[PDB]
Amino acid sequence: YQDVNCTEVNVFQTRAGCLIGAEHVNNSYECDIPIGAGICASYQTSQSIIAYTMSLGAENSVAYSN
Amino acid sequence: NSIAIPTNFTISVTTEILPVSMTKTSVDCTMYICGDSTECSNLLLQYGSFCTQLNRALTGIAVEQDKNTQEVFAQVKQIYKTPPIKDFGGFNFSQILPDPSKPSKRSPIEDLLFNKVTKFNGLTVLPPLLTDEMIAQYTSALLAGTITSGWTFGAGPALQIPFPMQMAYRFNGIGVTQNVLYENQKLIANQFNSAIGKIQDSLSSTPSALGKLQDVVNQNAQALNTLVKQLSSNFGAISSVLNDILSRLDPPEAEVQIDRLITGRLQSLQTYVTQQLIRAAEIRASANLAATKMSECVLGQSKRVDFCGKGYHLMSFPQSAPHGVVFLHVTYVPAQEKNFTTAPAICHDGKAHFPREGVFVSNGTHWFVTQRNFYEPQIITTDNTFVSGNCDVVIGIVNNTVYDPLQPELDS
Amino acid sequence: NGLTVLPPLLTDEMIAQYTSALLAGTITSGWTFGAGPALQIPFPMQMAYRFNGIGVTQNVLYENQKLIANQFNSAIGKIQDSLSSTPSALGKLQDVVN
Amino acid sequence: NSIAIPTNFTISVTTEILPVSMTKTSVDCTMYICGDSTECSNLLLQYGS
Amino acid sequence: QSLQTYVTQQLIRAAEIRASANLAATKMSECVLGQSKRVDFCGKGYHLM
Numbered sequence: 115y116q117d118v119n120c121t122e123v124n125v126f127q128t129r130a131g132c133l134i135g136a137e138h139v140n141n142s143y144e145c146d147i148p149i150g151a152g153i154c155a156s157y158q159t160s161q162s163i164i165a166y167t168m169s170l171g172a173e174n175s176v177a178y179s180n
Numbered sequence: 181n182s183i184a185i186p187t188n189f190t191i192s193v194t195t196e197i198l199p200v201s202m203t204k205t206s207v208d209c210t211m212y213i214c215g216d217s218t219e220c221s222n223l224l225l226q227y228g229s230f231c232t233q234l235n236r237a238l239t240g241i242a243v244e245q246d247k248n249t250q251e252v253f254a255q256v257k258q259i260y261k262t263p264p265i266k267d268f269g270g271f272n273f274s275q276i277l278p279d280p281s282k283p284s285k286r287s288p289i290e291d292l293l294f295n296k297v298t299k300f301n302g303l304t305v306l307p308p309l310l311t312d313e314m315i316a317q318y319t320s321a322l323l324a325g326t327i328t329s330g331w332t333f334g335a336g337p338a339l340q341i342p343f344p345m346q347m348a349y350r351f352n353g354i355g356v357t358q359n360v361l362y363e364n365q366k367l368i369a370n371q372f373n374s375a376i377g378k379i380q381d382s383l384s385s386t387p388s389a390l391g392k393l394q395d396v397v398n399q400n401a402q403a404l405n406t407l408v409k410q411l412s413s414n415f416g417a418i419s420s421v422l423n424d425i426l427s428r429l430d431p432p433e434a435e436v437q438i439d440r441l442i443t444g445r446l447q448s449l450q451t452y453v454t455q456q457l458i459r460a461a462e463i464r465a466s467a468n469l470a471a472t473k474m475s476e477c478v479l480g481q482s483k484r485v486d487f488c489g490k491g492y493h494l495m496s497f498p499q500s501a502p503h504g505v506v507f508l509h510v511t512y513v514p515a516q517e518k519n520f521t522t523a524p525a526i527c528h529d530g531k532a533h534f535p536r537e538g539v540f541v542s543n544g545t546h547w548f549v550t551q552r553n554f555y556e557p558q559i560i561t562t563d564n565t566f567v568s569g570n571c572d573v574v575i576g577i578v579n580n581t582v583y584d585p586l587q588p589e590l591d592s
Numbered sequence: 593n594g595l596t597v598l599p600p601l602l603t604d605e606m607i608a609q610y611t612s613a614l615l616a617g618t619i620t621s622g623w624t625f626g627a628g629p630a631l632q633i634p635f636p637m638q639m640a641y642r643f644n645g646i647g648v649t650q651n652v653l654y655e656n657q658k659l660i661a662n663q664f665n666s667a668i669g670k671i672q673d674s675l676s677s678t679p680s681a682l683g684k685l686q687d688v689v690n
Numbered sequence: 691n692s693i694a695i696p697t698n699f700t701i702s703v704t705t706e707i708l709p710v711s712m713t714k715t716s717v718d719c720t721m722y723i724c725g726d727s728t729e730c731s732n733l734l735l736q737y738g739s
Numbered sequence: 740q741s742l743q744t745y746v747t748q749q750l751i752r753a754a755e756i757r758a759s760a761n762l763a764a765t766k767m768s769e770c771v772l773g774q775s776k777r778v779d780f781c782g783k784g785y786h787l788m
């Protein structure tokens with residue numbers, strides 16, 4: 115539901131509104147279904163719909179020197 | 181027979197801004213045209229399916245904007261991080277790299293840009309998919325990669341390389357030998373740093389530098405305002421609000437008046453959406469131009485003249501501004517020049533002698549061969565002159581002597 | 593019926609002076625006049641750079657200067673003839689106007 | 691194992707033609723819709739902006 | 740209705756004319772002001788001036 119503060123309608127709240135039926139995983143993977151405002155959702159294993167925080171690619175660092 | 185070869189250069193840094201996208205909006209037909217009404221909705225029902233392709237077009241525009249930002253910024257696979265000890269030969273990027281001590285991780289020029297640039301009838305604004313800190317992570321990745329790696333992170337794995345050697349190659353790519361860098365490191369460093377500082381001050385003081393972002397926002401708002409201004413006009417009817425028409429009349433003619441309002445508001449919605457379609461087309465053109473600039477300009481040294489700044493091209497750095505990108509192109513410009521006398525060949529033993537790379541200049545009484553973008557003269561030997569023919573057919577040949585490094589050694 | 597026609601800001605003399613500047617620059621300077629200060633150069637040396645830029649070496653130009661000059665000139669003349677005779681030369685513009 | 695190399699050249703000069711700007715017109719709204727009239731302006735003030 | 744169709748058609752025409760104007764600007768900067776290497780951008784054959 116878009117933009118409702120969701121006191122008036124599992125339940126999760128975010129900048130885009132509140133979505134019902136999705137467990138907020140603290141992890142982060144490649145985006146599957148764009149939800150909005152940096153959060154997006156997928157269907158992953160029991161097998162459930164989850165809504166997590168997008169990733170930007172695996173971190174890296176190059177051993178620069180002179 | 182007169183050639184003018186520059187004897188001194190100057191680095192330059194110039195700003196080019198391109199808008200990427202716009203606001204993702206949406207408008208509900210029934211709530212705008214007949215909000216909280218029953219007779220109005222019944223009358224609107226018999227207009228076929230006009231107000232579903234409106235939402236179709238608007239959703240197309242919104243998802244398109246998300247695609248625009250994605251392809252403009254998300255061209256790096258991993259996320260690189262700049263080294264912990266910054267010793268870049270003398271160059272000072274402290275004004276473009278994100279400062280950790282900042283409250284929000286955005287480098288000072290990005291902060292300057294963010295500061296510089298500044299309803300409820302179903303009108304809804306969906307929020308963008310990417311968020312500004314994610315955009316900051318992308319541009320920091322691009323900057324760290326192009327500072328430690330070079331162009332090699334956009335053609336495979338990212339390979340490290342010092343920074344003075346990277347600029348040695350970036351000169352050697354525009355026909356200037358690299359010894360000019362390795363001997364004017366200090367001068368070039370100072371010109372680089374002072375140029376970036378001037379960029380900060382110039383765009384900070386002058387507030388109309390980035391107008392071609394602000395304009396976008398402005399005009400969008402105007403459209404929306406005009407839209408709501410159409411809910412207070414009576415389009416040739418009795419009044420401008422449904423409740424008064426219903427209360428003060430009967431259905432046999434309330435139907436007619438409501439029909440008039442429906443036609444007027446439907447026409448206003450149609451004009452709004454077609455205008456948005458044309459505007460989105462032009463903004464997509466500029467988004468594709470930004471993507472090409474980021475590919476051929478930020479990830480490589482380009483030769484397409486005046487694509488990447490007036491001058492020969494060296495480097496570029498991206499920064500993000502609200503709904504747009506700003507590039508800082510680092511270019512090279514020759515400054516001080518000098519007259520000389522030029523000659524296309526040198527008949528030495530009867531054979532001509534053309535130069536492999538470099539023109540044949542002279543001051544009053546001595547002939548030298550020098551490269552074509554920096555006065556650096558060497559003596560003429562058989563290591564930079566190749567022979568072809570006999571000295572007849574050229575029009576302009578000039579006698580001289582051409583040294584030979586092997587003669588004195590064989591004369592031991 | 594309220595159908596005005598504004599006049600263009602630049603006038604055909606102004607754009608004629610622009611294109612004369614571009615021509616005189618590329619004839620006396622080369623490409624060095626679009627990347628900073630304008631630097632003079634003969635014309636055969638400029639043609640030698642143009643030739644050297646596409647793989648062919650320069651001695652071909654400095655030894656076929658005469659022949660290349662004749663080919664250049666005759667080609668320009670036939671351009672004058674071909675776009676002078678044919679009626680459909682300027683079609684790309686005229687459609688716009690129509 | 692056979693290669694064919696040229697031994698002579700020829701210079702061409704091809705013309706190429708591009709539009710740049712169209713005609714700058716402008717049309718008044720009320721004068722076109724209907725001008726030199728009163729009922730026009732009175733009735734059209736309520737159509738919108 | 741007549742005015743609205745006229746102006747929308749004009750907007751689309753102006754858009755494609757702007758596309759051609761940008762193409763001409765790129766050709767004049769990259770080809771008149773510089774030697775080009777990207778084929779068949781500046782006439783069939785290798786490009787000189």
Ligand SMILES: *[C@@H]1O[C@H](CO)[C@@H](O)[C@H](O)[C@H]1NC(C)=O
Pocket residue numbers: 119121
């Ligand atoms: C409403 O939304 C805001 C988020 O901005 C939140 O602080 C607040 O807890 C929500 N509920 C109420 C009753 O305001």
Ligand SMILES: *[C@@H]1O[C@H](CO)[C@@H](O)[C@H](O)[C@H]1NC(C)=O
Pocket residue numbers: 188189190
């Ligand atoms: C080249 O230009 C700089 C100023 O931009 C000057 O300080 C430097 O001395 C010049 N080089 C020579 C040999 O004069």
Ligand SMILES: *[C@@H]1O[C@H](CO)[C@@H](O)[C@H](O)[C@H]1NC(C)=O
Pocket residue numbers: 272273274275
């Ligand atoms: C780099 O530039 C900044 C100017 O913003 C200066 O304050 C800082 O001292 C410089 N740091 C180094 C290592 O040169």
Ligand SMILES: *[C@@H]1O[C@H](CO)[C@@H](O)[C@H](O)[C@H]1NC(C)=O
Pocket residue numbers: 543544545546
């Ligand atoms: C070039 O330098 C001067 C001109 O200032 C000239 O007299 C001289 O003959 C030329 N050659 C050398 C080695 O100085």
Ligand SMILES: *[C@@H]1O[C@H](CO)[C@@H](O)[C@H](O)[C@H]1NC(C)=O
Pocket residue numbers: 181575576577
């Ligand atoms: C340049 O022009 C002058 C006068 O026309 C002529 O005498 C001279 O031979 C020319 N210089 C060369 C190298 O051909």
Ligand SMILES: *[C@@H]1O[C@H](CO)[C@@H](O)[C@H](O)[C@H]1NC(C)=O
Pocket residue numbers: 527578579
């Ligand atoms: C060049 O050398 C030959 C023989 O030494 C001579 O005939 C010719 O006149 C010379 N040309 C000049 C300009 O000295």
Ligand SMILES: *[C@@H]1O[C@H](CO)[C@@H](O)[C@H](O)[C@H]1NC(C)=O
Pocket residue numbers: 698699
């Ligand atoms: C090359 O082509 C031209 C065309 O007329 C011709 O005149 C010339 O004799 C040919 N041979 C050489 C060696 O250039």
